Design a protein around this ligand. Structure first.
Ligand SMILES: Cc1cc2nc3c(=O)[nH]c(=O)nc-3n(C[C@H](O)[C@H](O)[C@H](O)COP(=O)(O)OP(=O)(O)OC[C@H]3O[C@@H](n4cnc5c(N)ncnc54)[C@H](O)[C@@H]3O)c2cc1C
Ligand SMILES: Cc1cc2nc3c(=O)[nH]c(=O)nc-3n(C[C@H](O)[C@H](O)[C@H](O)COP(=O)(O)OP(=O)(O)OC[C@H]3O[C@@H](n4cnc5c(N)ncnc54)[C@H](O)[C@@H]3O)c2cc1C
Ligand SMILES: NC(=O)c1ccc[n+]([C@@H]2O[C@H](COP(=O)([O-])OP(=O)(O)OC[C@H]3O[C@@H](n4cnc5c(N)ncnc54)[C@H](O)[C@@H]3O)[C@@H](O)[C@H]2O)c1
Ligand SMILES: NC(=O)c1ccc[n+]([C@@H]2O[C@H](COP(=O)([O-])OP(=O)(O)OC[C@H]3O[C@@H](n4cnc5c(N)ncnc54)[C@H](O)[C@@H]3O)[C@@H](O)[C@H]2O)c1
Lengths: 435, 445
């Protein structure tokens, strides 16, 4: 069996890639081999607006109100927008098929071939590894019993949302382990639901505050406070030593000694780029950033690009990196799809991300947004309600967070791009309508 | 604003081998080598070896040397006639290889597929190879030294350096070689060979315990140094230069250890700096570990940019990311880059190797990860890295460089015609129960 564009993984980058492949190559035959039985869907509403919707039937429909009151599905497109795997090689105008429930287990890079779990083989011409990541689990939950594992869940998928929101109607306490994006958003989502249902929502993580890897300390702190205000028990500086079952419920034991009892743990502890295919593939992984080491164009080897969460790419302006964001999956998937159809475009228009942690934390971020970098923050009118945060390297702005600053990403994009050695970052903040 | 389908930046071995690879695979390919060096692509090995062993009084003029068979050879890869001019290249039937000598690419516009040269001219390309090699590192002790001393201290890389140094070897009472690596050792041996007739004082000083300390296990390095001494070299191992000045009309090297060397001339053979200036304007990734441009298994940097030779930091699928600065590697990587520039999509796979000679008792070959930082097992004939030997005569043997219970590198020590065995051993990743049984494969028994 053969397909021109084999997108390994049925996610956002694969869909964006399938879309940009199809935008750039309107006849393209794209087989998404998706080990997931679900058709591609955006993950963000699984931790945001799928929770915000009225209608108990939201869980079945998987539909959500957008920023304007217009509703839409989590699925990138109706199932009827896809052609079947069997029809894919034959259907006129090509299309996008998803072989759902099938996993690529061997990447014969030399042979441009994948072997699936069912022993079946598919060759390809262009391959996007858009395998994303699997939620890292906690060492403590792996070494724990069959009982605790049956009530600890990872969160990535529709089934995780469905399990979790069902659980959110069934149990009285859900603990989110992880202080990054997903922890913080699931915290807030569950927080919002707890307004009407009264469920306990605990969020816990090793850093000083939410988004610790991302936000400078002062701002990570201001944010944690906003997440708390969403109805979340936020527990920073938390390292899990072990997890057991106790009194029907789960008992999480922290290194510092604190202990969380909860009915259900969601561990959002970062992502392991799914690089299993590298070994048989002879593909280089980045030992620093993880993921498949790819260049500015998302390319690993001649016919293999990697996009989305699994891609460790070179940013010409910002250096080598890996980014795990929907818009990056979209941007890099789109880019890889463009590059898979020959754009030879380096990553350049920066992917951004946004996060909402309640109504007072709406931010957008671009570039090297890493709390390990020097930063300069300038804020309106400590009150960090509105401001702009500059991540700096070699006397130059390398990352920007637009903090409740709306409609200014263009300006941020421009500062990142220009590598100006700013005489006065206070004058630069004024560009973001921060005085 | 000219254009060339294949642009190779740098006019050395890698560029040459890429040129001939591109040409082999894409016959009729038009390939422009841009070379800041006024000289055409030449091989550097004889500059430290056979051009000194020549007793031809004209060898500095001719740059010719006799090979193994006694057949004479130029250090140039091919004669100047075998290249097309840069003007003729866009047009010449079935393309070929042009060299823009004395021209430095000073800007690489990767987006616009373009380079800008030092005279301000621009060249677009379809596929580009960066093969800029490296430039000898200088000793900062010389850099900070005065005008007089600097003008009596030479780097050694190029034909010009051979000529200057060989001239100096007939004028002065004493030359000091600084550096104990490949080039220092070979030049010291070269000069020592010379001193048997000239009575010139030949001194070699380097920080390592013995010659070739970065690649040979110590016992072998030491044995090698004794062989170098016996070449008529005052070998001063363990030497780090503190300052160089002028005293009594002669150079005065002051070593950190307090030794002084009064000498008339200094050559500093202190390693190579990969030439990566174009990464900057190019927005090309440099490898901060190995130095050089960072490229994949296929030696590819960007859609249309590859890198090869001393300047290429590449991914070895079986052995990992590396950069090698060896003639045969410049050959192997240039060859491969060339192939990939022409669609081959092939990973580095066939391993390059190297060799060195330090007088008549020291001739060796090496393949894979040959690095005195690796564990080694050496097996020799009767007559902090682990350095094992299998039962002071290190006249002949095989040295296995190990990683992950697998041979990842091999040195064949006065063992000739066994590289393919070494190579298979490297390739097969067998976990050998008995390296003495493996050494039997090398006629060590
Ligand atoms: C709940 C949630 C919410 C988010 N919200 C936001 C947000 O608001 N803003 C933001 O910027 N980012 C957000 N993100 C991050 C964003 O969704 C990810 O960056 C994005 O999903 C990356 O997509 P991907 O296609 O690279 O990987 P994935 O979406 O992980 O898709 C990869 C797919 O490939 C499959 N796969 C793996 N290996 C194989 C194999 N060998 N064979 C076949 N299939 C395989 C996996 O099962 C998976 O289905 C969110 C993520 C989650 C999980
Ligand atoms: C005296 C000597 C002896 C050696 N003996 C041995 C040996 O016995 N065995 C062995 O294995 N190896 C030996 N080597 C090492 C071997 O010669 C090198 O590995 C090989 O020369 C590397 O080839 P290259 O093409 O990568 O780089 P180089 O040969 O350095 O060629 C690069 C060329 O590109 C030019 N260049 C740089 N930047 C630009 C630019 N921007 N624009 C245009 N041109 C540019 C440089 O000036 C240079 O001329 C020896 C080296 C020397 C110096
Ligand atoms: N708006 C958004 O950008 C958004 C929203 C939801 C999800 N996501 C994405 O979803 C993916 C998964 O999200 P995530 O939040 O799990 O990852 P993340 O990288 O955002 O955060 C990882 C967090 O896990 C925690 N962690 C790491 N090691 C730990 C350890 N061993 N023990 C306990 N905690 C540990 C830390 O708190 C760390 O900040 C990420 O790729 C993320 O980018 C993004
Ligand atoms: N047979 C061969 O493979 C061969 C022969 C000659 C030259 N070469 C090549 O030529 C290039 C240059 O040769 P090289 O011998 O200069 O490089 P090298 O890397 O082989 O040796 C560097 C040596 O320089 C000396 N050194 C480094 N820093 C020093 C310091 N600051 N002070 C004093 N000494 C210092 C050390 O002895 C070290 O071994 C290399 O790329 C090398 O591979 C190879």
């Amino acid at each position: 069996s053969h397909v021109p564009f084999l997108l390994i993984g049925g996610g956002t980058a694969a869909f964006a890639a399938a879309r940009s492949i199809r935008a750039r190559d309107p006849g393209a035959r794209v087989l998404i081999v998706s080990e997931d039985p679900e058709l591609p869907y955006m993950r963000p509403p699984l931790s945001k607006e799928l929770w915000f919707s009225d209608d108990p039937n939201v869980t079945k429909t998987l539909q959500f109100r957008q920023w304007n009151g217009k509703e839409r599905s989590i699925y990138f497109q109706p199932p009827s927008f896809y052609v079947s795997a069997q029809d894919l090689p034959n259907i006129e105008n090509g299309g996008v098929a998803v072989l759902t429930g099938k996993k690529v287990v061997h990447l014969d890079v030399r042979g441009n071939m994948v072997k699936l779990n069912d022993g079946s083989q598919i060759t390809f011409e262009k391959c996007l590894i858009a395998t994303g990541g699997t939620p890292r689990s906690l060492s403590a939950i792996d070494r724990a019993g069959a009982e605790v594992k049956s009530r600890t869940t990872l969160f990535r998928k529709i089934g995780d949302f469905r399990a979790l929101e069902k659980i959110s109607r069934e149990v009285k306490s859900i603990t989110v382990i992880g202080g990054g994006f997903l922890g913080s958003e699931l915290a807030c989502a569950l927080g919002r639901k707890s307004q009407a249902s009264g469920i306990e929502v605990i969020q816990l993580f090793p850093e000083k505050g939410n988004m610790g890897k991302i936000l400078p300390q002062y701002l990570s702190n201001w944010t944690m406070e906003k997440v708390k205000r969403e109805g979340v028990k936020v527990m920073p500086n938390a390292i899990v030593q072990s997890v057991g079952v106790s009194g029907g419920r789960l008992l999480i034991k922290l290194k510092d000694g604190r202990k969380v009892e909860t009915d259900h743990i969601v561990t959002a502890v970062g992502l392991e780029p799914n690089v299993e295919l590298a070994k048989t593939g002879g593909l280089e992984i980045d030992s620093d950033f993880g993921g498949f080491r790819v260049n500015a164009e998302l390319q690993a080897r001649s016919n293999i690009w990697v996009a989305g969460d699994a891609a460790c790419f070179y940013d010409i302006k910002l250096g080598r990196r890996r980014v795990e964001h929907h818009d990056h999956a979209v941007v890099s998937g789109r880019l890889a799809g463009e590059n898979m159809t020959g754009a030879a475009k380096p990553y350049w228009h920066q992917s951004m991300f946004w996060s909402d942690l309640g109504p007072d934390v709406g931010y957008e971020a671009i570039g090297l947004v890493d709390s390990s970098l020097p930063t300069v923050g300038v804020f309106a009118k400590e009150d960090y309600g509105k401001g702009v945060i500059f991540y700096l390297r070699d006397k130059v702005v390398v990352g920007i967070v637009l903090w409740n600053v709306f409609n200014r990403m263009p300006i941020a994009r421009k500062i990142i791009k220009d590598g100006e050695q700013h005489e006065d970052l206070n004058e630069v903040a004024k560009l973001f309508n921060i005085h």
